[PDB]
Assembly symmetry: D2
């Protein structure tokens, strides 16, 4: 079918787009850098199987993909934001508004724009790439963490109404997901190359390693395949067993 | 100590303010209507044991209560919003922005404004009145439900950083909480007067009744008393056993 | 690889075994009925793609499969129990002991018997088929529901220690999962053939239908394939959006 | 009213009994040591406000308290077990049976024995002291952690049926709860005396300290008072913000 992957260059974007395309889907890709023709053309050349779009806004993007490929069957809202770790009193209120806009309002706007066509034909899949941070909150990241939780619940809530139209809705919350060249949020440098970082990952995850783009991609393609729609409403914690809890003194 | 209860006329406002006052606290009350001298005066006359403030914005309010009474020891963010039940595609993106501003940004702004003083003296209590909808979402209320989830997690996330400063943070998520004359969200009419509504409540809650303002107030005062700070991070589901799940055919 | 599916004739047994086999795995199958050669041979003839075992106990089963097929790479603990619905005071304490033995001790015993070999190779996958009842408890089924919760947490706890040996552990908790000819727990008759039952499923699930053995099988095969080990520790709610929560009077 | 607190000398026993008594309740106490006359009398002398009982089994205990004090209004099932940390394959299946019998079957048996009298008069409170380990499992404690999870769910499931009879059911899950002279599970020595243990607690809890018996008691008394029955079904995590999750390299 036809799929849309947002912010393709970052977070769970490449894994999702690449595997979806390998599965036979036509994959329209969005990214902030695609505003520049040079960036869009370069992407199209490197990944000829993907279909980069210049459209930036929700309604604009959904309309563009629908016109170019007929309809949108799979929506992968791969949302990102660049937060700072700050004590609550050090954040500016605008810092939270920014987090909520990028992590909650955006996915909401995308579903709001594509839901009608999916409901009319009673078919489609909606996948939010959120975060596992709500499951094990770190101190001093209240904006990003709470916004991600809003997105997770948004997906679960949406599954309740869209199920009547045979539209599954899922949320994939990753952590320690290798992002390769993207800084969102675990790039090769330094996460796979610096001792302290490698050791940190070994300590906090059960599998003692970063998750791979391949793994995220396999999950996305599996859910979008229609092989297991009954998991609708699920929030998947793609965090390799994180968080590992510190044990008592003397214990290995 | 000195407490602040927002939107006192609605939701968990009166139960919280009244019980906190009976516990001996000086309770500064906020409400949109207090912007009008006539409304504020009428409230002060009816409730001489309460201290209504005219201030509307977070910083302005925190500053006024601090100036008049010395400091803010307890913050009860009784947040409200009037959402419409709507299919995802029928909402306007602005409807979600409105829900998040009222249910997430506001409590965040209040803590952002008061956290510094609490941290400097290493004492204080923060309580968010959220919702239990995230625990059992209804179809077609995605904006309100997801926003409330963001608030619940915000409370939990804040508990992690403020604990070092001896500041407990809690979230109380009610449902079917009798709101008396307030339309937010279970007024006496029709929830205690109309047969069908009375029957609905008896079916969906384990205790088969609406929760009382007194019960909410008791919990708020208990948490604010410093009797059980070790519950910091807790999201309390004040919903009387809701949700009750429909059983198989043949089962009463 | 080599997989083991217990209680193959019931619950998620057939879906798991059939899809695992279609995936290319050698699937050893356990069932209480296989104690009778007549039943085992009858099963073997009907399903040449499966390998029914006569062994009933954990240690004996693991040893038998290891001897016959080299080793056990995938363990699918498809646990079942036949509980009665009853008020807490009407149950016999033995009724709870029985539920716990069948739903907690059994999966524990199986992992206890196969873990050492998997750890030595630093490879293997463990899947518990539990229940979604803990997520939305019905009244009067305290034994079954709580035991299933124990099994879910057992899986999550195990993922923490086995991750170090590269062994993912998952729990799939279904509800309204079509069980075809098996009475555990949603057989064709009457769940797909009686109006009241069809209507009940339509009301309590978001997708308004029973889950299929195919869907459960696809998930089991996907997890066992090694395509997404990073989901280790996950409890999957395979309940089609259940539970759907009763809305206010007047709402459709 | 009349309350029963089990294993009073350990875990949440003393805080519960002491505060319930201070609240004016007649508190019948159970403990394995009370099997010996010398132990029961020594306890009665030290704590004259408490009523130690010699009864050990659920039925006889409920009956004895009912005969002596008229009825059982509050049941505080303070369950304990002394597990060993072990890799799954190192445990004996009997070690899990032992954990489940003490942490799941026991509370179930007590409610099974007292539920009828509470239902007949439509009044009563049931509180299980479980554990917060299910919320953040450590590696190698699969027996204890999963059993405690079963108990938490048992309480939640029970709230659904007993609510109709006006009987709230709660579960209090502590961790890092100072147990003073009792080895279950954080005695003064070494948790408040050894530097490494003191440092560990300051690291893994948000409040950076052990919880007190006083705090636990305050919660139990509050819940038993009938001041906030609408919290029925709640699982309280009395863990001071635990778990604190390790942050990235460079962050303090
Ligand atoms: O900003 N951060 O430090 C950050 C850390 C982790 C995440 C994981 C992927 O959700 C996201 C953001
Ligand atoms: O708008 N609504 O229909 C609504 C219903 C229930 C709530 C409960 C209190 O959280 C809030 C809003
Ligand atoms: O006995 N029962 O009524 C029953 C109902 C539901 C289940 C779901 C699959 O876990 C199991 C048993
Ligand atoms: O055995 N243990 O090591 C243990 C550790 C912590 C607990 C906390 C109270 O639940 C219980 C048992």
């Amino acid at each position: 079918s036809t799929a849309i992957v947002t912010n393709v260059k970052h977070f769970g974007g490449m894994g999702s787009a690449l595997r979806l395309s390998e599965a036979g889907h036509t994959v329209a890709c969005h990214d902030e850098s695609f505003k520049q023709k040079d960036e869009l053309e370069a992407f199209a050349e490197t990944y000829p199987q993907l279909k980069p779009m210049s459209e930036q806004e929700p309604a604009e993007l959904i309309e563009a993909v629908t016109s170019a490929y007929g309809q949108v069957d799979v929506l992968v809202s791969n949302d990102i934001f660049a937060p700072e770790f700050q004590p609550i009193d050090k954040y500016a209120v605008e810092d939270y508004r920014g987090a909520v806009e990028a992590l909650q309002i955006r996915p909401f706007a995308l579903v709001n724009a594509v839901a009608s066509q999916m409901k009319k034909r009673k078919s489609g899949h909606i996948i939010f790439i959120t975060s596992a941070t709500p499951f094990g909150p770190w101190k001093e990241l209240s904006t990003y963490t709470s916004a991600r939780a809003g997105a997770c619940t948004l997906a679960n809530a949406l599954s309740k109404e869209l199920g009547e139209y045979n539209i599954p809705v899922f949320a994939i919350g990753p952590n320690y997901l290798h992002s390769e060249d993207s800084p969102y949020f675990y790039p090769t440098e330094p996460w796979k190359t610096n001792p302290e970082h490698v050791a940190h990952v070994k300590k906090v995850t059960a599998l003692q390693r970063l998750g791979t783009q391949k793994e995220l991609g396999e999950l996305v393609a599996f859910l979008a395949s229609g092989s297991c729609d009954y998991l609708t409403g699920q929030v998947f914690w793609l965090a390799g067993g994180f968080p590992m809890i510190e044990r008592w003194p003397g214990m290995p």
